[PDB]
Design a protein around this ligand. Sequence first.
Ligand code: CU
Length: 196
Amino acid sequence: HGVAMMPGSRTYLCQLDAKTGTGALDPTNPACQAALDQSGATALYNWFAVLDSNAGGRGAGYVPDGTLCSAGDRSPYDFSAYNAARSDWPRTHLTSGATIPVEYSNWAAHPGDFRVYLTKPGWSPTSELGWDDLELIQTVTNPPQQGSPGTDGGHYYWDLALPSGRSGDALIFMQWVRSDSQENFFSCSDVVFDGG
Ligand SMILES: [Cu+2]
């Protein structure tokens, strides 16, 4: 159980945006409000649970185009709204060419690979996210953890050298492929290359 925390995934950033001291969910970001209204609060309480029990490392030909951010709509929860092709989702501001510290939730820890992909130049978030819009840029095998599994703020951590020559909006998609299970996790992070 986990999705990306830095650059944060849609469900993670939306749950941070909605978080209140009583546990009520009150987002101010409009894409987050829309996703709450469509798919429900359960998605944000379970922001880490974007999973397909049977994916088994499969991607194109199995996870339909336009459904990556909800694990093909095969999870135990409704994450369908987190596929909305909108440009107003919360996003992380990045510098093209910089190496950044990546954090991925270890809400429940598992052995495996993190397959990290970046949308191609020219792709923008008002378009459908398909496999042919993504390029595999890194695979991270069994990275280390900071914080115990199931504790607030706990995460896997590794470095990512961001490609040069990029600008404007993009998305980083990660597939967490367990080595001990067919269960995989699906993570989508809105970013913009406007730094430096
Ligand atoms: Cu898990």
